[PDB]
Design a protein around this ligand. Structure first.
Ligand SMILES: Nc1ncnc2c1ncn2[C@@H]1O[C@H](COP(=O)(O)OP(=O)(O)OP(=O)(O)O)[C@@H](O)[C@H]1O
Ligand SMILES: [Mg+2]
Lengths: 66, 48, 157, 375
């Protein structure tokens, strides 16, 4: 969330993600275990259109896993 | 080393970075095969 | 009568122009060979700066050896092929540009790309069919189709 | 009897074409060979002038060389600070050049934002109208304020939560206005070489001054605009150095002529009070979350191109769209289209939009819109 060096790199990251002439044909996938640290603008709908929640495996899901 | 050109694949040309000194486009000595060089590779070069 | 008189000129002109073409080709061969042997292969890569207009084909160069140079003539590369900030290989002594080069980005970024191409199939992922379908339709469909979106008109995620 | 005549005439014409092509090859060869024998020239910036034949040049990042003008250069043009080229042999000046360097500024100018009309933004009429009063009217019609008497503000800042259209508004301004426009990512103007970022700020301001009228846009200004640390690493040192450089550039003693400036930030609080001082950033523009009417407007904007099927009730979507930032509604349209894709349909209906709204409202719980502060 918003040591200013990591902040500046992160800001460069969101500006690359948004982008003048946005995104051309470049798709981005991100994986985290702790959303609460991400917060202010990285989770913005523009930069990350889809938030996909991974729950603990279901019982039938666990059976398929094994 | 960096980004083998390989435009004509005969003498593929090699860009190197003599760190603290300069960057260059160079070839290989005839002793070392191109298959012996990958990207980066920390390669040593002659002085001339 | 006719068609029998012009025969001398129409072929003699062709043969003489062919000989002229042969000599002209020889001159081109000599020039090309001298230029090629002139193309030494250290090139001291350098970044391109503003292409200032000519005034009585001018480029300003920042070298990899942290020096700036002005070129009255670019060299063996076309002017508009250059884009300030571009990377060119120049003469190690006269600093004339004789190359066009791929940009190169960084060692980290080149190590960043995937060449192994791992081999996990969606079948090995279990119990996430909602999530797998979500990610697949979010990413792969713009990669493959790109016509469903334009037909609907939406900007793909 | 056309066979021999016309066939051999065509042969001669074809051979003439091959000759002109080959002579074009030779012209290229001789021209580049003549260009080959030339040599480059060192570049450096003429300092104080001693006599009409003695000059002082700092050869860029090299030393300071006493040199003399060649023969033809108008000595008047060789002003203290102008950029000249020197022979690498005798070091004599032989041509003054356009002022300075740095293709970084070139990229930050030739950035292409795309065509974005003000109509493509929705629900910001007051702010959009406000910006044109400080960004467009002064440079288009300066003579107006002469009679008003009030001097024009030079910089003004856009602040608001993520996803309300700040960068979009900047893109629109860049696209529609006919003037020189600089686009800044506040991160990339921060380089590791000692004292290079302040130099870059200086050169970009110089480029703006030389190319008047000019617009500077600094997105995420909080990257360097942060409050000045009392102590820190080289990071704090050089970042505050660059901040004070930018300050001297815009604050005063230089009284920027046509250097109207725009910046945006998601965190206006962290900005140093020196920036937020009115003399630099006179018109602070708050770009709030879109209102329900504004939400309907932007929804109409982004749902427009969609090949809908049947009626669309934007009002219900607005009703369920509580607290959505502007970017969210674009995500709403995208998700409705994606639901239509899932149904394999070639059209989108109201229920697709409704499902999209529910889906992004669920995601809305993730982006914790904190106790957010203005400047
Ligand atoms: N009022 C609006 N009208 C139209 N589209 C809007 C509006 N507000 C937001 N949007 C949409 O949301 C995005 C606007 O976000 P933009 O990239 O301009 O920056 P931001 O979210 O304001 O902040 P930053 O880029 O500084 O993090 C665009 O994709 C645009 O289509
Ligand atoms: Mg922005």
């Amino acid at each position: 969330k918003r040591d200013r060096e990591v902040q500046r790199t992160m800001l460069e990251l969101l500006n690359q993600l948004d982008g003048f002439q946005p995104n051309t044909q470049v798709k981005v996938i991100a994986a985290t275990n702790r959303v609460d640290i991400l917060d202010p603008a990285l989770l913005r709908s523009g930069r990350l259109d889809r938030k996909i929640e991974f729950p603990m495996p279901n019982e039938e899901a666990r059976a398929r896993i094994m | 080393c960096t980004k083998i050109i390989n435009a004509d694949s005969e003498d593929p040309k090699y860009i190197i970075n003599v760190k603290q000194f300069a960057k260059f486009v160079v070839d290989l000595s005839d002793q070392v095969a191109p298959t012996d060089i990958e990207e980066g590779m920390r390669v040593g070069v002659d002085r001339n | 009568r006719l068609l029998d008189s012009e025969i001398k000129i129409m072929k003699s002109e062709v043969l003489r122009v062919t000989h002229e073409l042969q000599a002209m080709k020889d001159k081109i061969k000599e020039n090309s060979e001298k230029i090629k042997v002139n193309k030494t292969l250290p090139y001291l890569v350098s970044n391109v700066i503003e292409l200032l207009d000519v005034d009585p084909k001018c480029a300003v160069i920042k070298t990899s050896t942290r020096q700036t140079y002005f070129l009255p003539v670019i060299g063996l590369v076309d002017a508009e092929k250059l884009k300030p900030g571009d990377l060119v290989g120049v003469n190690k002594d006269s600093y004339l540009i004789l190359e066009t080069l791929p940009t190169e980005y960084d060692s980290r970024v080149k190590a960043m790309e995937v060449d192994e191409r791992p081999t996990e199939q969606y079948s090995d992922i279990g119990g996430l069919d909602k999530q797998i379908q979500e990610l697949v339709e979010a990413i792969v469909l713009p990669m493959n189709h790109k016509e469903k979106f334009e037909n609907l008109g939406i900007q793909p995620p | 009897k056309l066979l021999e005549h016309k066939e051999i005439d065509g042969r001669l014409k074809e051979l003439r074409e091959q000759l002109k092509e080959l002579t074009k090859q030779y012209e290229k060869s001789e021209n580049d060979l003549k260009a080959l024998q030339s040599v480059g020239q060192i570049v450096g910036e003429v300092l104080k002038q001693l006599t009409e034949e003695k000059f002082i040049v700092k050869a860029t990042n090299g030393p300071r060389y006493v040199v003399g003008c060649r023969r033809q250069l108008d000595k008047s043009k060789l002003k203290p600070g102008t950029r000249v080229a020197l022979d690498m042999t005798t070091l004599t000046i032989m041509r003054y050049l356009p002022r300075e360097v740095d293709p970084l500024v070139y990229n930050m100018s030739h950035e292409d934002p795309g065509n974005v009309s003000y109509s493509e933004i929705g629900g910001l009429s007051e702010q959009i109208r406000e910006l044109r009063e400080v960004i467009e009217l002064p440079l288009t019609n300066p003579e107006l304020f002469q009679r008003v008497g009030i001097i024009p503000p030079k910089g003004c800042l856009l602040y608001g939560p993520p996803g309300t259209g700040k960068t979009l508004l900047a893109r629109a301004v860049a696209s529609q206005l006919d003037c020189n426009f600089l686009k800044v990512v506040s991160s990339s103007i921060v380089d590791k070489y000692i004292g290079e970022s302040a130099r870059l700020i200086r050169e970009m301001f110089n480029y703006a001054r030389d190319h008047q009228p000019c617009i500077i846009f600094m997105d995420e200004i909080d990257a360097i605009g942060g409050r000045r640390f009392s102590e820190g690493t080289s990071a704090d040192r050089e970042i505050q150095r660059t901040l004070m450089e930018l300050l001297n550039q815009m604050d005063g003693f230089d009284t920027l002529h046509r250097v109207k400036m725009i910046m945006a930030t998601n965190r206006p609080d962290t900005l140093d009070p020196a920036l937020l001082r009115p003399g630099r950033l006179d018109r602070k523009i708050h770009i709030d979350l879109p209102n329900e009417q504004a939400r309907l407007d932007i929804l109409k904007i982004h749902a427009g191109p969609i090949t809908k099927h049947g009626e669309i009730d934007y009002e219900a979507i607005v009703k369920l769209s509580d607290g959505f930032n502007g970017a969210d509604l674009r995500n709403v349209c995208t998700e409705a289209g994606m639901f239509a894709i899932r149904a394999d349909h070639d059209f989108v209906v109201q229920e697709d939009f409704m499902k999209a709204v529910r889906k992004v409202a669920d995601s809305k719980k993730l982006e914790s819109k904190l106790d957010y502060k203005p400047v």
